[PDB]
Design a protein around this ligand. Structure first.
Ligand SMILES: CC(C)(CO)C(=O)C(=O)O
Ligand SMILES: CC(C)(CO)C(=O)C(=O)O
Ligand SMILES: CC(C)(CO)C(=O)C(=O)O
Ligand SMILES: CC(C)(CO)C(=O)C(=O)O
Ligand SMILES: CC(C)(CO)C(=O)C(=O)O
Ligand SMILES: CC(C)(CO)C(=O)C(=O)O
Ligand SMILES: CC(C)(CO)C(=O)C(=O)O
Ligand SMILES: [Mg+2]
Ligand SMILES: [Mg+2]
Ligand SMILES: [Mg+2]
Ligand SMILES: [Mg+2]
Ligand SMILES: [Mg+2]
Ligand SMILES: [Mg+2]
Ligand SMILES: [Mg+2]
Lengths: 262, 262, 262, 262, 262, 262, 262
């Protein structure tokens, strides 16, 4: 079975690895059959699956529904499940909601934010729940930011994110997702932290990559995000698209400069 | 907004029309944007979405969840939603369950079965719920049949299906799905009924066609049903696949003889 | 306190009377202060208040909420409340749901449909619930009709509405709303029935009129229904618009030919 | 997957087949791995699992719990689940409770009783639920008869059982269990019915056999019933015991004369 | 009845004693009838009974269901019940969930972890709940560890486990389970603690032993843990297997070197 | 295990038998230990246990509570449980409430009333629920009668009770309680029925007797019912008192003339 | 109405007083009629009434049920009600559960334990709940002790109980139950405390006495506890037995040396 141990090993080897979102049996099974064995059941489903204009409406029950479907499709994958908006407002609530998504199939939970989470991370880890951190453009805070804007620009913002990343790691987070930050900051965080750092919109300097699968096969309409690539476009079939994604991540061909912020 | 009126116009014009399954915002919007504006939120999602070995586990709440998602994706489509297993066991229950899915965004409910449903259909239509019939291989009854097997062969079984189709029409059904029957029988039913008849594994003699989108884009693992076609394999991206499907249904190229039973 | 018996009087006197929808304290109080004393808490609120594309999502609790608010603003009005989509699917269900809106402040419930409702109307009236019928374009059935289309054209459809109107009356309906039918049919129904007939898109030949207040008093966007008139445009203030509406109904100036179907 | 189709085929070929009770993953998997592919999740669990002195306390939720566990262990088996005491008192209840156990993983429900069940069976099968009848000794009626004794002795009782068997088959039951009746009667019934008949305490003249697993491995201990055999003996191999049971049923040597009543 | 007082007496006399998991009436009764009077209703049932790939899905209500069953079969046994994943995340939750399993028939609750549980253990005991600790490989933490791996290797690890064992004893725990630890560490802890230490994968140096009964008595099959023994294979019948397990524990023949980690 | 079969044998031997009410473990155990093996968990507990001035407040849940307690005390007794006031108002409700008390440990349910119950009794018995009838002074109807009064005096009332007794027997009732009627009438009913008739206030002409145990040991204050006898008296031994009640029922000494109505 | 103030006066007077358990209307009224005016609705009902082998299954709802019944029988008695197992695990839970039994008719609540309870007792009394303490053999802790064993022997344990007693008093407890301790310890505690101490198995040195009514009339089977006396055997009837109990408590004849521990 694919474990957190394996990703830590890949970091020690400087072997860049691919990860992907998934929300149903069919895609989860397709990814697993191609050897893409790290999947995130993310509250991005609020948008790509449910059709809301933010991730805030997603509930813990919604995550648990999609987590079970993904687990059925990929019984041996490493499965990260988001805790959605206001599902980790106190350590007690975090314990309850983490347990719901883990009992539904997840191996790890992902929660958004910085140093305020330290206690929650320490206590979750102690209670058998592995935690993936999430910094930068954390979409649950879209209303605070006033939009989906690049974070971590400026010495002060950058320095806050570095210290948050170190705090989460010291609290026991075993992975970190870094979203839409300058590549120069992503490199600094990746070098500073012993745990694996998984980037989206953070350039090819991270230890791993994530993408929303709907951007990845041009299912999503309009212009895809700057940081995303349609791998279906130039393979012909979805399985081939998956394999191209895996190989470009490992070689560092993806993300390219065109997919990165500064 | 596409309505049942439009499909009745197409039957009168002998313009064969394509319809497709859909279970989320992203696919629903893609379909609508390409001009495919009849979608079924079917209990097939029990298999393709949830990963069960049959459609039986799918609940009314599941259908409602997926219905609301599809409706956000395709605000103007004609949206058919299945009533799942044991959700129409009595007229009263049918009323309540139909209402749930209609409030969630459906314009019509689809239910499986023949003559025994006549009272239910009459009453539903009085109560503002349009009904699509479903005859032939009705997958909710997979345990009765002992598998997914072709129905309607031989004069007795064929005559009964014709009888059932006319009965459902007389009860107020405004559409009918015929699944996995001889083309010959599909032709008789299509010519006998004034309402539009939508086929899947019924050949190209029906007024319209349906397929599960997961087979259409090659997502599903293994070898696809004889009656299905992977359109993504010949077109290369998903939107062009959708347009090829629309075109080939209209020209009668799909289903071909190879997709048909006798 | 305005009662059904006052309306019945007005018909005997051939005094045409105005009625209006209302969904909150402020407008209800404004209308009452102007002497517009017949209000409908209708499932139109699903669209004009809630913002859905149909009335179907409206619940009995929604109706009861608005009903209480309207009653607080207009303690002496004749208050009709709609039973919404699938809230009267059986007589038992109709009893429970009628009772909820009446306990919340309604004097009378309005239900949509023809002959199939006779038993329900008989039984409701027996159990102390006055009933207003609703024929023609009955908006809960929009999916059956395939849109908001004029009903009652041609001899058969006209004969069915006239017969349905007489059957609801015989069953104990004390009022009837007729919506979007030819004026000539509205005239025949109004003349055939002893109970008052309130028209909307039925021309000026009915005993009374109704309008959604958002259309009447200049709030609704784009092009209001063809049968509606903006009374605020040519009176300047909402109270004057209310008085003009009342006056023009009584004089038969509203609805005009421009607001009428044939 | 083993289906009702396959057992019907076995009857047509005169290939006697084994079936067994199961209530958890570990035993269901052991059985499936030996090719013993028909499993009964019966209310007998009330005694062997729960430890009550009767099956009456067993609930529909209990059956669904055990059903899901057996289905995990044996994904491809034909899984019969009992409806327990008072879970089929009306057709409407039978529909609800049958649906629960089938959604949890059953392929067919087993209900005890004769001719009074005909309507229920007819309506279940319409509504996609296969039914296994159960005649002879029917343990849910223990307080009626005041014990567990051999049924069908004498002409009147025997003729009544044959009549009930034919009536259940005519109503749509696709399988029948006969429990503790004379071999001669079991032969009459098996020969009269086109559907397969599965015996326990009915001798080797039936199409198939059932036993309680807890008796089959000497788990229960004490005096095992006359009709049962401990296959484990002193072999120290449960898998070998299962194989021996399957083989003795197929050859017709189990049940022996010593396990039979006249 | 068998009590904690008895096991404390056994440790004083240096009589090593056998304990076993049980989850139903039939096996509990069998074990009691052979004199094996200490039973654990463990969250191992998630895997052996329910068929999940981990213990995390097991609920408090599941534990309570199986506890009542075992108590029916073994009215006089000492009955330990696990609190499952996240059922003791705070003292208050531990109180509530412990009380549930104790009311259902347990004499004592087992919880996994070290120093962080001291306050919970202290408070549980004040509130009438005896506690069994559990150190070493604690299977609810499978996702933290990344698998089922041997714990306590090296100086820092072994010292920490000794410290935690003494800490749990001082907090009031009356028993300790030690799982998959080097034999030498198990001997250090066993000699340091006054309370009985029960081993699994800890060698024969503990005061007693535990195993999952499905592994021990031949149901799991060829793949049982390294530290387990199939006692049925060499004894022929399940009762004789139970007696052999009891005897070999007491003689120190089981566990052997082949079952032990260093 | 005492069964209805035994009582039926006793009638055939003309061996009169004692029965008693019980509502807790201790008295049930005491009774069982003396061989008083037929107990009623009666809605009389509304008065003797709960302290109400009538039995009407007793709920099904109350009966089930007391039933389980009596069953724990007397595992082998024949245990009748009353369905309380309005717990058998329709056959469907009777099935649900009977099931509840049978699952809690009852072998048979008792319900009050005559011919209007025929369908309920037929259907209960068909669904594995043995029924005891109850005629004469049926205390749930105290408000109808305007108190606790002797029933069946006069030809018309007497004839109706005889008709009712025969009707209930023919419907499938297996026992009948006859309460506070003329001895003369009790003799007719007893001779006319094949099933056993248990008297209270019916004289010594019935097949058996029942009393409220609180009257039977001079626990109840005031003057006890004319028909009751305090067997404890000044003997200082409740067990001796039980044996005396049993002995006097069988010899015919109790009830005496003094305890009888004419 | 008997109050706590009365018992405090009896302690000053050294007038030893009897108390008794009661769980129903009939015994409560009997006790009140004889002037035995202090009653405990104890969790002992778990054994004597419900038939469990310990008091742990008893719920707050059970206490409240029996509490209302006793209050109906004895409107003017001083009514103590136990908080059962884990009903006072935190102060906040104690408040809620104490209020439930007080609203049901209790005047005071009894809770088991020593110094750990001080905050709970202080806060309960502040919030209008009088508290009775309970030390020595506290039956909710049977699993901790390994049975029902005399407590307080030897100086360590004795001194600890005296300390706890004084601590509960200083916290606001208004009464104390002492159970199964040496007589000389009961004397030390009774003399050190200003509040009344009620003994059971504590000898005649306490200010009052408690007995389980089922032991007091020889209802309980077998050989009653050493500290109990069957008062009925020598008095003939239950009221005389109650009067003898009262008298022998006041004279100091009960408990005798034979009912005492050392
Ligand atoms: C896309 C990503 C990795 C960043 O928000 C995510 O967290 C999600 O899918 O929900
Ligand atoms: C595609 C079809 C018609 C197959 O039964 C369907 O109903 C579904 O998608 O659920
Ligand atoms: C608009 C009107 C009067 C007619 O549909 C109505 O019934 C409503 O407001 O809901
Ligand atoms: C084995 C059989 C058929 C006998 O009652 C059964 O029904 C059960 O296991 O519950
Ligand atoms: C397997 C064992 C004995 C050790 O983890 C256990 O705790 C369980 O059975 O759940
Ligand atoms: C004893 C009797 C017959 C009194 O009606 C009874 O039914 C009861 O105890 O509830
Ligand atoms: C009699 C006493 C005081 C002994 O525990 C008691 O608390 C009870 O009856 O529950
Ligand atoms: Mg996310
Ligand atoms: Mg479908
Ligand atoms: Mg309306
Ligand atoms: Mg069964
Ligand atoms: Mg465990
Ligand atoms: Mg009664
Ligand atoms: Mg107590």
């Amino acid at each position: 079975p694919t474990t957190i141990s394996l990703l830590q090993k890949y970091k020690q080897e400087k072997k860049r690895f691919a990860t992907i979102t998934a929300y149903d049996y069919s895609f989860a099974k397709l990814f697993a059959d191609e050897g893409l064995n790290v999947m995130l059941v993310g509250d991005s489903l609020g948008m790509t699956v449910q059709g809301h204009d933010s991730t805030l409406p997603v509930t813990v029950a919604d995550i648990a529904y999609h987590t079970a479907a993904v687990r059925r499709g990929a019984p041996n994958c490493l499965l990260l499940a988001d805790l959605p908006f206001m599902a980790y407002a106190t350590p007690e609530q975090a314990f309850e909601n983490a347990a719901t998504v883990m009992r539904a199939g997840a191996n790890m939970v992902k929660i958004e934010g910085g140093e305020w989470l330290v206690e929650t991370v320490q206590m979750l880890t102690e209670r058998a729940v592995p935690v993936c951190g999430h910094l930068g453009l954390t979409p649950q805070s879209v209303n605070i930011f006033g939009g989906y804007k690049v974070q971590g620009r400026g010495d002060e913002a950058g320095d806050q994110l570095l210290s948050d990343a170190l705090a989460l790691e010291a609290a026991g987070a075993q992975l970190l997702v870094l979203e839409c930050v300058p590549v120069e900051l992503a490199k600094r965080i990746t070098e500073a932290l012993a745990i694996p750092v998984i980037g989206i919109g953070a350039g090819n300097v991270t230890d791993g990559q994530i993408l929303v699968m709907h951007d990845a096969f041009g299912i999503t309409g309009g212009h895809i995000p700057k940081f995303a690539k349609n791998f279906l476009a130039e393979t012909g079939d979805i399985r081939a698209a998956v394999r191209q994604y895996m190989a470009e991540v490992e070689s560092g061909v993806y993300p390219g400069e065109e997919h990165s912020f500064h």
